Amino acid sequence: PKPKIVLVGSGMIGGVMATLIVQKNLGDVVMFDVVKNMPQGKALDTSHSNVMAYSNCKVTGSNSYDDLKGADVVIVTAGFTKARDDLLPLNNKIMIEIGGHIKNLCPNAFIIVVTNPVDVMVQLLFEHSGVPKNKIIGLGGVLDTSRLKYYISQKLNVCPRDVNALIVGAHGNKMVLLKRYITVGGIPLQEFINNKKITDEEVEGIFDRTVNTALEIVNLLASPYVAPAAAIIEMAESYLKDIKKVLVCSTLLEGQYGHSNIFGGTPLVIGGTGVEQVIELQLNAEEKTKFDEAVAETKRMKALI
C-alpha cells in the first residue's frame, strides 16, 4: 500500500534520511546496519516524530539483510571510510553481498548507491544485483551542485534554488564543474560577471571550495550528512511521486561523452519507472577533456578491486 524504503546503512546519513522520510510521509522505513543496537535505537527515536509531523510512516531497525524483502527503494550507505585505494576491495565485497540479497528479495527495487567512490560502487552493485540499467543510480551531482549553487547564491544574495549548475563526470576530486552552464534565475552567470556583481576569481574560488567542501567540514570537526541525505531524498522522492525532476546522478554510460561501460554523473530524469531519460550535454572540447579525466579516474580505481 505504502512504499517500503530500506536504508542499507544507518549512520549519520541514514539517520537524517529516516527523519526526512517521516517529515514528508514518504513511506515505511527499515533502518539496516551491521552494528547491532544502533538502528533499532534510531528507528524508535524517529518513529515518535510521526506525531509532530502528522505522518504515518513505520520506522523499524534491523540487522538482518532479509528485511530487504519487498523493498521499493534501497539506499546503500554501508561501507568502510578508513582502517585510501585500499578500501576498494573491501567495499567490493559489501556490494557483492548486498547485490546478492537485492537479487533475491527485492529484484524490482529502485537502488540509490552512496558508498564512495560512488561511480565505482554503483557499477559493482549494478552487476552483482542484476537490476536493470534504469533502476540503479549513484548520489553525486545533486550533492556537489547543491554546494556550488549555495555558495553562488550567497554571493549574489538570491534564493539558493534559483541558481542552477551542472557537475558531471564523477563525484569526487575529478568532478567537472561546467562554468558555461550556470544560471541565476534562468540568467547566464556571465551576465552577473559582466555586471561586476561577481568576479571570475570569486567563481574559481567557489569552484575550489565546492571540490573541497567535504574536507572543509571534516577539518571543522564534523562530517557531511545533512546535505547528502536531503540530496538522496530528493532523488527518491522524484521516483516515488513520479515527478520527473532533472537531476544529475551517476548512471550507466553506453556511448555518451565517448565512454561506454562505466558509470558517470550526467543529468537525468527520475520518474515513476526509474531513470526515464539520460541527457547527454553537448560539451565542447575543454569540457570533454575534463570529463574524460573524470571517467579515467573511475576506471583507474575500478581496475583495483
Ligand X SMILES: Nc1ccn([C@H]2C[C@H](O)[C@@H](COP(=O)(O)O)O2)c(=O)n1
Ligand Y SMILES: Nc1nc2c(ncn2[C@H]2C[C@H](O)[C@@H](COP(=O)(O)O)O2)c(=O)[nH]1
Ligand Z SMILES: Nc1ncnc2c1ncn2[C@H]1C[C@H](O)[C@@H](COP(=O)(O)O)O1
Annotated binding site: 9-14, 33, 65, 79-80, 91, 97, 114-116, 139
Among 54-62, 76-84, 156-164, 182-190, the segment contacting ligand Z (CB under 6 A): 76-84
Contact flag: residue 11 with ligand Y (CB under 6 A): yes
Shortest CA distance to 207 belongs to which of 145, 299, 291, 300? 145
Residues between 78 and 137 that touch a copy of itself (CB under 8 A):
none
Q: Extract the annotated binding site for NADH.
A: 12-13, 33, 65, 79-80, 97, 114, 116, 139
Options 14, 61, 138, 140; binder of a copy of itself; rule CB under 8 A: 61
Provide the mask over 153-172, with x wherever binding to a copy of itself is found by CB under 8 A and - wherever it is not. Answer: x---xxxxxxxxxx------
Shortest CA distance to 141 belongs to which of 176, 186, 179? 176
Contact flag: residue 97 with ligand Z (CB under 6 A): yes
Contact flag: residue 77 with a copy of itself (CB under 8 A): no
51-56-57-60 Cα dihedral, nearest 10 degrees: 70
Query: Nearer to ligand Y by C-beta: 8 or 175?
Result: 8
> How far is it, in rounded angstroms, from Cα 33 to Cα 11?
8
Residues between 197 and 236 that touch a copy of itself (CB under 8 A):
213, 216-227, 230-231, 233-234
- Residue 25 corresponds to which cell in the numbers above? 510521509
Binding site for ligand Z (CB under 6 A): 34-35, 78-80, 83, 94, 97
